[PDB]
């Protein structure tokens, strides 16, 4: 669920 900043 945690968005990948890249």
């Amino acid at each position: 669920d945690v968005v990948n900043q890249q």
Epitope: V2, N4, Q5
Partner: antibody, heavy 120, light 109 residues
């Protein structure tokens, strides 16, 4: 080693613009995101947002939209923070901070910080 | 947005524990809580990530945990160099990062 080197301190007048550079060495620049963090004198850290070095897309924290631009020059492995329409309350040390893999919400390496002083 | 007590203190060799209270939408929702140590006029340094993990070079004297909506950093075996400001941070369900206000740790005696 992984290193983030920022440009020198600057004085700017109200309403002017300033651009701070954060030059990355020691790793593949386009492989990891870059975050920006502000610290007003005597105050705490504030997250400003992040930029993807793969797409170039910036994402700004709610308090830092409108006047703040994250940008990149990949050919010189450099991330840039531009502040426009400078205000007295913009006086702060600004840090670039690398996003540790796999998602970038941990800051493993930090630039040494740049003091921007806004004053007439 | 994250709540830390303003200060902390301990004697050389003893332990200090610093709290960092968020919400179910950050500290209580995810495992991306970080702790940074900052000496005056220096860049912050990562000492704990993902609630309990340590980056290269940080001794196990430093430990992190969380329960419910509050994360906690424990510095055991306090030394003079530990005197510094400590900041927690966490990911949010809004896909942002929030910091705590910081805790100034002083070594007494």
């Amino acid at each position: 080693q992984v290193q983030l080197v920022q440009s020198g301190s600057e004085l700017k007048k109200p309403g002017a613009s300033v651009r701070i550079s954060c030059k990355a060495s020691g790793y593949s620049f386009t492989s990891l995101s870059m975050n920006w963090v502000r610290q007003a004198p005597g105050q705490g850290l504030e997250w400003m947002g992040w930029i993807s070095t793969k797409s170039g897309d910036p994402t700004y924290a709610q308090a830092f939209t409108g006047r703040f631009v994250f940008s990149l020059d990949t050919s010189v492995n450099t991330a840039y923070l531009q502040i426009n329409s400078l205000e007295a309350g913009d006086t702060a040390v600004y840090y670039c901070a690398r996003g540790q893999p796999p998602v970038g919400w941990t800051f493993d390496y930090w630039g040494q910080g740049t003091l921007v002083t806004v004053s007439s | 947005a994250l709540t830390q007590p303003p200060s902390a203190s301990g004697s050389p060799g003893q332990s200090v524990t610093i709290s960092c209270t968020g919400t179910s939408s950050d500290v209580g929702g995810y495992n991306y809580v970080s702790w940074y140590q900052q000496h005056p006029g220096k860049a912050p340094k990562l000492i704990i990530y993902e609630v309990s993990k340590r980056p290269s070079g940080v001794p196990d004297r430093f430990s992190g945990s969380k329960s419910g909506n509050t994360a906690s950093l424990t510095v055991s075996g306090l030394q003079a160099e530990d005197e510094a400001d400590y900041y927690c941070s966490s990911y949010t369900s809004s896909s942002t990062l929030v910091f705590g206000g910081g805790t100034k740790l002083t070594v007494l005696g």
